[PDB]
Amino acid sequence: MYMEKLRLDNRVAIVTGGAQNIGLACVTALAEAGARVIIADLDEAMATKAVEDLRMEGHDVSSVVMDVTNTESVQNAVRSVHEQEGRVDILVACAGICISEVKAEDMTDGQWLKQVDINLNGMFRSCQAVGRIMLEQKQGVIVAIGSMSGLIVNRPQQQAAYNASKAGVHQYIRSLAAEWAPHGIRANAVAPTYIETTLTRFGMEKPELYDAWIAGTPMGRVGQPDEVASVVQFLASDAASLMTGAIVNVDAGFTVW
Amino acid sequence: MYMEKLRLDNRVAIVTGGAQNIGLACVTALAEAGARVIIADLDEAMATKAVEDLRMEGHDVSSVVMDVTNTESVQNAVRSVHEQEGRVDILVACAGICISEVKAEDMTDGQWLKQVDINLNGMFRSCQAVGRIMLEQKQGVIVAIGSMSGLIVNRPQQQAAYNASKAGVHQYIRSLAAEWAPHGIRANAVAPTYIETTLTRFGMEKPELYDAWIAGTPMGRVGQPDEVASVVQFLASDAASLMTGAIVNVDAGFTVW
Amino acid sequence: MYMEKLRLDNRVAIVTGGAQNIGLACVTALAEAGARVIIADLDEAMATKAVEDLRMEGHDVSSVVMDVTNTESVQNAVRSVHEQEGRVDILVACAGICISEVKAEDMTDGQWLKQVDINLNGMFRSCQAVGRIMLEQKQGVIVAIGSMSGLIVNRPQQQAAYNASKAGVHQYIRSLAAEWAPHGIRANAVAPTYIETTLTRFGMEKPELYDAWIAGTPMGRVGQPDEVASVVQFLASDAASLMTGAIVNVDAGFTVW
Amino acid sequence: MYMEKLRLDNRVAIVTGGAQNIGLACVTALAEAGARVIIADLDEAMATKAVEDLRMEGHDVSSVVMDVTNTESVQNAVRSVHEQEGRVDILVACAGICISEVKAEDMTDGQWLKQVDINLNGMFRSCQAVGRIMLEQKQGVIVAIGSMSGLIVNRPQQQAAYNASKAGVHQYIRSLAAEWAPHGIRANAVAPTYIETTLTRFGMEKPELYDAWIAGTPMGRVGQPDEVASVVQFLASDAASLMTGAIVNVDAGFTVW
Ligand SMILES: [Mg+2]
Ligand SMILES: [Mg+2]
């Protein structure tokens, strides 16, 4: 019973931002659990390459181009997955950016709007498009990649738009959880600490940043993408049947202090 | 000494959305505490009427036209206040809208983006413009009107964009609190329950909505604008000297259950 | 109207732990707002000196001996105040201790139990005894001194029993808020950061502790007792009429990071 | 890789309150993941029955008498497991009681103190005794059974001591997470909604209670023990390697409204 609940055999999953980093780890975890996974990403090349690596390991993985700033792109990408796969059982929404080391008094409208558009408006576009399909199935699960930045404020790097966008993502996901609970849908978010990715490594290589991050973390380390993916895979599975609207802290204790 | 900490004599306060409802109650409380208050609102006629009423009560109140969806408008209005008054000591940010009874699957891009733009992007525009002056002064206080909707999901009315945008406001304010703490600035938010205003008439006059609201509230009532204004005035005052980044629940116990 | 809401003229307030530090600041603030205040404290000589000092300033104050580890003591002290003054309008519950720099693997039963008994069990004894009178009145307000330690875990000093006891206090107060809301009673807590007091001054003179506390605080300072007393006085007043079950953060931004 | 992270083969787990209901479900989940499990419970005959049933399925399960109000009992039971098994890898702390429908103004000292003693003091006793072994090992994981009652206040049933005790449990576990993170130990809690058990059956058959619980739940149902056990098993596993100090909501959306 209990180990079987963790399986995702034959379930169709779309992972936005799935071509690299946390997204790619989530793709890999879902695929290992038996899911049919579609990488939805802005980079057509990256996605196609990732698909090859994963098929190489025997995974049922495909790709579609998606731009989360563009409603038409998102809806076209979701429709074509629905077309080819017949169903969408799982959405993992990882698409996001972080514009950091930009003081609140300095940030431009363009920086503000871009940050909110990708992280928060993109979450709306993604979840709405997939949600409509899940509603007709009366079955589905969404996992969003939130951030501890939605709950606490990072130091010393300034990024108020990021922090606000992720708090928005958390409460948006909770709203969906409430609205869609009677219709067989669950929606949760993970809120990770710093994860070593191609992008955060620039922060990691700057001692003023990295030393503060480590000093502020009880476990004394950043996380790795597979550690976020394991939680995401769990939340996507029937093992998590009683969980909806949860902001799950995956942060090495950062928010405890 | 304790009672004198509550006074705001000669302090310059800008209240966005100050022409009616919670905004106007905040303007009144600030003025009664001794502040020189500027109503910053979209509706010039409504603002001018409010100014006339308050001036007849012996208060020092004026108004300025401000559209929080427009950066130029916000920057010009804030500069005008600074030029005419000499300082900006306090910002109370009330400007906001709520598009409700719109299901998450049905909400248009237009509805989502308008709510995020006024509630959240408007908060950035207003706090940055005022914040720059406060940073120069190495002194200032911001109070945002957040919402219990930033932490819990209202029922039965669907309003996922509102809920997300207000969670965004809370965490934005907290980011400003952290960034600006060393510079003599405090920033807090109030998170109220339902308040009787023109904007909640549609719910209060609809039994399916109102009865649910009351049943969900330990005090068994909605709040009045003056009850929010009292907390806002407190948070704007030196009595709240140790409070920054606080999301202050003003909700008749609604979030307790 | 707004400034009048802050007054407590002729209201009867009991302050447990009121003889020094945060308790005494709360006593002072309440007295300055017009309340008749009873210091309820274990140390008779200390309470008596405090009463005599405040009386010299024109305040209406008195004291009663109360041991919050002892139910008979608490009940007798509260009954005595009720008979002597005719009513109990306000309870501010400050009595507490902090056993710190004791690792979780080392803490004895005696150390654990004493901390829980004073901080949490003593909160139940105090609140029940006053609460019964407030229920008869259909009117009352409780303010507990909680702690940021109920929400986050202090560093580097170990004090898991204190942290647990204060989280217990916060949720106990919220429980009372919910149960007693229909009967004209409000109950809230403050959650302060480090406050300079006779007790914490030892930690403040220990760089390993003090430097960590300052480094973790956005305002870069500890608080002063009067800054907590201001928030407590506000929460005890009709100005806070819409607030019940609130855990009000008074922490110089400590919990924001 | 991802599926192997969920395995607990040959790891030693003690489950307090493990003979029935949630505890028994946790025992079963751990055993199905390959753990060596010891039921630690108040009554010997009840635990023995469970052992016999699980051994019939080929599981490696045993039991020990443990009374969590009694330090000697707890220390002796933990020592017995250590001497028989050579290590303790996992503690799931489920021992607890709920005295409910007792108004705050009515609750006796005996009722308050017993609830705090079993739920909170017993958590300290259990966690210290096991924690000492885990510190020697520089390896261990604790999962406490908290409650949504630590975060929100149940209705209509009055149970302030239970609510307080569980908030205490949450913050005690977070304190252990912070203190023991550098030493290879993780500590998290689950915060469930109503779970159908032999004890909650009586409430579920009282319409005044059950109808309110259902109406308060987005999923419109209570949970089953296996749904809590699945989350506990995940948290105990290396798949949860990045999670410590998390209060994980498993509440069918109850705390979202
Ligand atoms: Mg922190
Ligand atoms: Mg609720």
Give CA–CA dist A89/A75, Å, rounded.
16
Cα gap B17→B219, rounded to integer Å: 28
Q: Which residues contact A214 (CB under 8 A, 6 or more apart)?
A: A220, A221, A222
Q: By the 8 A CB rule, do A65 and A44 touch?
A: yes
The contacts of residue C15 (CB under 8 Å, 6+ apart) are C23, C26, C27, C30, C37, C38, C39, C40, C91, C92, C94
- Among residues D162, D172, D194, D210, the one annotated as catalytic is D162
Breaks (C-N over 2.5 A) in chain B follow: none
Residue B216 corresponds to which tokens in the numbers above? 């969900």
What number of CA atoms fall less than 13 Å from residue D51's CA on the CB side? 18
Chain C contacts in chain D segment 18-57 (CB below 8 A): none
Provide the number of structural domains found in chain A. Answer: 1
Q: What is the CA radius of gyration of chain D?
A: 17
Residue B53 phi/psi, 5-degree rounding, is: -55, -50
Residue D158 belongs to what domain range? 1-257
Dump the DSSP string for A127-188: HHHHHHHHHHHT-EEEEEE--GGGTS--SSS--HHHHHHHHHHHHHHHHHHHHHGGGTEEEE
At C6, the amino acid letter reads L
Contact D110, D33 (CB under 8 A): no
- Shortest Cα distance from B142 to chain C (angstroms)? 14
Cα separation, A174 vs A123, in Å, equals 12
Question: Widest CA span of chain C, in angstroms?
Answer: 55
Distances in whole angstroms, Cα of residue A93 to Cα of each of A66, A108, A174, A237, C8: 12, 26, 14, 15, 53
Q: Which contacts of D135-140 are long-range, i.e. CB under 8 A and separated by 24 or more positions?
A: D135/C105, D135/D180, D135/D183, D135/D185, D137/D87, D137/D88, D137/D89, D137/D184, D138/D183, D138/D184, D139/D89, D139/D184, D139/D185, D140/D88, D140/D89, D140/D90, D140/D91, D140/D180, D140/D184, D140/D185, D140/D186
Q: With an 8 Å Cβ cutoff, are B244 and C229 in contact? A: no
As given in the structure block, the two tokens for residue D111 are: 């009722």
Q: What three-state secondary structure class fits D222?
A: coil
Tell me how crowded residue A100 is: count the other CB atoms within 10 A of its CB: 18
Which residues in chain B are closer than 8 Å to A74, comparing Cβ atoms?
Answer: none
Q: How many residues does chain D have?
A: 257
Does residue B135 belong to the interface with chain D, where contact is any CB pair within 8 Å?
no
Between vectors from CA D254 to CA D209 and to CA A240, what angle results, nearest 5°? 120
Give the mutation candidate from C24, C243, C250 for the B interface (greatest B CB count, under 10 A): C243
DSSP readout, chain C?
-TTGGG--TT-EEEEETTTSHHHHHHHHHHHHTT-EEEEEES-HHHHHHHHHHHHHTT--EEEEE--TT-HHHHHHHHHHHHHHHS---EEEE-------S--TTT--HHHHHHHHIIIIIHHHHHHHHHHHHHHHHT-EEEEEE--GGGTS--SSS--HHHHHHHHHHHHHHHHHHHHHGGGTEEEEEEEE--B--TTTHHHHT-HHHHHHHHHT-TTSS-B-HHHHHHHHHHHHSGGGTT--S-EEEESTTTTT-
Q: Does A242 touch chain C (CB under 8 A)?
A: no
Neighbours of D19 (CB within 10 A): 24
Distance of alpha carbon D184 from the chain centroid: 21
Number of Cβ atoms within 10 Å of the Cβ of D132 = 18
**DSSP letter at A120?**
I
Report how far ligand 2's centroid is from the alpha carbon of D151 (Å).
Answer: 9
Contact between chains at C256 and A153 (C-beta distance less than 8 A): yes
3-state secondary structure of B24: helix
Task: Say how far apart CA C154 and CA C163 lie, in whole Å.
Answer: 8
Pair C177, C234: CB distance under 8 Å: no
And the tokens for B156?
Answer: 């039965």
Q: Is the dihedral of CA D63, D66, D68, D73 positive or negative?
A: negative
Phi, psi values for residue C187, rounded to 5°: -145, 125
Handedness of CA C50, C53, C57, C58 (dihedral sign): positive
Contact criterion met (CB below 8 Å) for A156 and A209: yes
Inter-chain touch B150–A171, beta carbons under 8 Å: yes
Query: From CA B46, how far away is CA B24, in angstroms rounded?
Result: 11
DSSP string, B87-114: ---EEEE-------S--TTT--HHHHHH
Q: What is the DSSP letter of B58?
A: T
Residue A229's CB: how many other CB atoms inside 10 A? 28
Three-state secondary-structure class, residue B63? strand
In CATH, what number is assigned to the domain containing residue B108? 3.40.50.720
What would the two tokens of residue C188 be?
A: 């809230």
HSE-up of residue A56 (Cα within 13 Å, Cβ side): 7
Q: Which of A157, A249, A257 to mutate to test the interface with C (most CBs of C within 10 A)?
A: A257
Q: Name the binding residues of C.
A: 257
* Most distant CA pair in chain D, distance: 55
From the CA of A155, which ligand is nearest?
Answer: 1
Residue type, position B214, single letter = I
Instruction: Give the number of other CB atoms < 10 A from CB of residue C20.
Output: 21
DSSP secondary structure, D81-148, as one string: HHHHHS---EEEE-------S--TTT--HHHHHHHHIIIIIHHHHHHHHHHHHHHHHT-EEEEEE--G
Separation in Å, CA of C19 to nearest CA in chain B? 18
Q: Which of A139, A144, A145 is nearest to A180 (CA)?
A: A139
Candidates B133, B120, B246, B219; CA nearest to B183 is B133
Task: Report how far residue C73's alpha carbon sits from residue C64's, in angstroms, rounded to the nearest whole number.
Answer: 10
- Residue appearing with tokens 């009515």: D106
Neighbours of C177 (CB within 10 A): 26
Chains contacting A (3 or more CB pairs within 8 Å): B, C, D
Q: How far apart are CA B92 and CA B5, in angstroms?
A: 18
Whether residues D242 and A248 touch (CB distance < 8 A) is answered with: no
The three-state secondary structure class of A4 is helix
Q: Which two tokens stand for residue A18?
A: 């799935």
CA distance B163 to A178: 12
Find the Cα–Cα–Cα–Cα dihedral A84, A85, A90, A92, rounded to 10°: -30
User: Residue A31 carries which DSSP code?
Assistant: H
Catalogue the E-assigned strands of chain A.
12-16, 36-41, 61-65, 90-93, 140-145, 185-192, 247-250
Distances, alpha carbon B118 to alpha carbons A168, B16, B69, B115, D256, in Å: 14, 11, 6, 6, 25
State the virtual CA torsion across D13, D15, D18, D24 in degrees, nearest 10. -50
Q: What is the resolution of this structure in A?
A: 1.8
What is the SS3 assignment for D188?
A: strand
According to DSSP, the residues that pair with C185 across neighbouring strands are C140
The DSSP output letter for A200 is: T
Name the nearest CA neighbour of D88 among D40, D29, D25. D40
The answer to whether D118 and D69 are in contact (CB under 8 A) is yes
Q: Tokens representing D125?
A: 């006793």
Give chain C's radius of gyration (CA, Å). Answer: 17
Alpha-carbon gap, residue A144 to A93, rounded angstroms? 5
Cβ atoms within 10 Å, residue D82? 18
Both tokens of residue D165? 């005790």
Measured distance CA(D145)–CA(D122) in Å, rounded: 12
Distance from CA of A203 to the nearest CA of B (A): 18
Check if C194 is active-site.
no
Give the 3-state secondary structure of residue D75. helix
Rg of chain A (C-alpha set): 17
Q: Which ligand is in closest contact with the Cα of B151?
A: 2
Distance between Cα D213 and ligand 2 center (Å): 12
Technique that determined the structure? X-ray
Tokens of C16: 């447990």
- A158, A105 in Cβ contact below 8 A? no
Instruction: Give the distance between the most distant pair of CA atoms in chain B.
Output: 55
User: CA B8 to CA B143: how far, in whole Å?
Assistant: 14
Please name the residue that has the structure tokens 């919050």: C68
